């Protein structure tokens, strides 16, 4: 149905890993303990108690990856560097040269094949010890290291790179590391749970966000003064960004859609885009979001220059500002309630991750939602995506047999073309991802790859949704 010329000529094609869900070796070539080292080594975290440790051993079987995103047609890969491969101390202790060489020789192998690298900076994972010293995101100190760590990136290997995220899903990561508690570093309050190390669900999300988007325009302030006249790449954000629904036609549930929406996205990139947090969380918390001071104000003047849209799944959104819903959900403080059904219909096929939906309009709005509010920023599809996991599969064969998958895509690429047709400026698609790999609090449960993973031995061997994305990017 859609096929590769119904995209620009100058488009991006590629797939999308992270560090600690595909490299292992966690703890070789002087890297230090993550966040994510430390949490899965703790009872009760992880669904199958697995860990991040070996992963797809991506650090010793890189150059076979490349091989097979090259054998698919890619034109482009998007991963992240591990910050305590870089760093494994943060600012003051050293950066590690085989941490740099590591990159380096992935960025020449895939720049070897034609593959343009797209690079995050941090997805998820922080040296433990800036955590240990001044706990991470809840002090301004962050700012200074993810300056230094981007800046050490930037001078080693800005001259391939022209593409660079600072940070993926912050809008995940902070929620559920200070609001819920289900993320390192596991902090919250009632009524979103009791956590043992403590917390404050009301207050330290938005200090923790206000951190991270002042480290993203400390990070672009350093890019666009030192660096973009030699360099001349792009310096963005990365996003989760689900598309809501009114559960029901009415403007209380249209309002609380619009709500939903906002405390998402607009969260990170009102305030990298119009120097304010969005007005729709300024009414609701209104000193809980801190200030930025003129010195922060100078930064975001800055901006990003494009959005990284991770865009999945699509849900309903009903109001709870007028009515009493139950509280301690994440959308709680946008006083709206999210599900995927309406009347026991599910708002598209349901799949193996609770609340991804087959909805493709999904991503032509989400995008649409985008261009109105952001008066068309350019924008990358980061991550797009399906999960297989449960009962049905117990061997190879299974999982290799996922027409469900090639369907997803399918659909998905199918509404994109159509909103850049409609003036979307959408430069670029990243499918989640390459291969299986450790997919967060669902350890190895849950399988989004191009490339099915034995566990055991380490084989890589591509499922028909591999086949067919190679077809496609064949035209
Ligand atoms: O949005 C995402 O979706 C992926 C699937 O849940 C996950 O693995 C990535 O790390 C995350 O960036």
Redesign the pocket.
């Known amino acids: 149905a859609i096929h590769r010329s119904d995209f620009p000529a100058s488009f991006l094609f590629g797939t999308?890993t992270?560090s600690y869900?595909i490299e292992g070796a966690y703890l070789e070539g002087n890297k230090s303990l993550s966040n994510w080292d430390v949490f899965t080594h703790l009872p009760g975290n992880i669904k199958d108690g697995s860990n991040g440790d070996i992963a797809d051993d991506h650090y010793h079987r890189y150059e076979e990856d490349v091989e097979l995103m090259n054998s698919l047609g890619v034109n482009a890969y998007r991963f992240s560097i591990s910050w305590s491969r870089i760093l494994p101390k943060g600012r003051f202790g050293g950066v590690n040269p085989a941490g740099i060489d590591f990159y380096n020789k992935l960025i020449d192998s895939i720049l070897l094949k034609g593959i343009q690298p797209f690079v995050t900076l941090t997805?998820?994972d922080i040296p433990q010890e800036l955590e240990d010293r001044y706990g991470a995101w809840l002090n301004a100190e962050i700012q200074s290291d993810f300056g230094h760590f981007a800046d050490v990136c930037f001078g080693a290997f800005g001259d391939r790179v022209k593409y660079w995220t600072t940070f993926?899903?912050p809008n995940?990561a902070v929620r559920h590391g200070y609001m819920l508690g289900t993320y390192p570093p596991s902090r919250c309050s009632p009524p979103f749970g009791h956590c043992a190390r403590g917390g404050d669900s009301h207050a330290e999300p938005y200090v923790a966000a206000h951190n991270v988007i002042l480290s993203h325009a400390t990070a672009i302030e350093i890019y666009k003064r030192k660096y973009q006249s030699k360099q001349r790449g792009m310096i963005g954000m990365?996003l989760?960004s689900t598309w809501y629904e009114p559960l029901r036609d009415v403007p209380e549930d249209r309002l609380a859609t619009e709500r939903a929406l906002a405390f998402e996205t607009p969260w990170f990139l009102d305030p990298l885009v119009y120097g304010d947090y969005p007005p729709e969380m300024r009414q609701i918390l209104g000193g809980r979001l801190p200030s930025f001071s003129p010195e922060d104000r100078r930064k975001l003047r800055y901006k990003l220059d494009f959005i990284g849209v991770?865009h999945?799944t699509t849900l309903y959104a009903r109001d709870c500002m007028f009515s009493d819903c139950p509280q301690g959900q994440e959308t709680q403080h946008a006083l709206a309630a999210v599900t995927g059904e309406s009347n026991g219909l599910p708002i598209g096929t349901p799949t193996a991750?609770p609340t991804?939906y087959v909805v493709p309009d999904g991503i032509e709005k989400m995008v649409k939602y985008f261009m109105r509010r952001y008066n068309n920023l350019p924008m990358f599809i980061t991550?797009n995506?399906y999960?297989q996991g449960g009962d049905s599969y117990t061997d190879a064969e299974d999982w290799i047999d996922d027409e469900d998958r090639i369907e997803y895509l399918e659909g998905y690429l199918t509404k994109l073309a159509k909103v850049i047709r409609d003036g979307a400026d959408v430069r670029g698609y990243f499918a989640?991802?390459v291969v299986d790999?450790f997919?967060?609090l669902?350890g190895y449960t849950?399988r989004?790859g191009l490339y099915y993973i034995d566990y055991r031995t380490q084989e890589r061997s591509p499922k028909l949704s591999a086949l067919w994305y190679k077809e496609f990017l064949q035209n």
Do not use: P
């Open positions: 999308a992270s869900q997805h998820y993926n899903e995940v990365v989760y991770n999945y991750m991804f991550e995506g999960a989640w991802s790999n997919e967060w669902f849950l989004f």
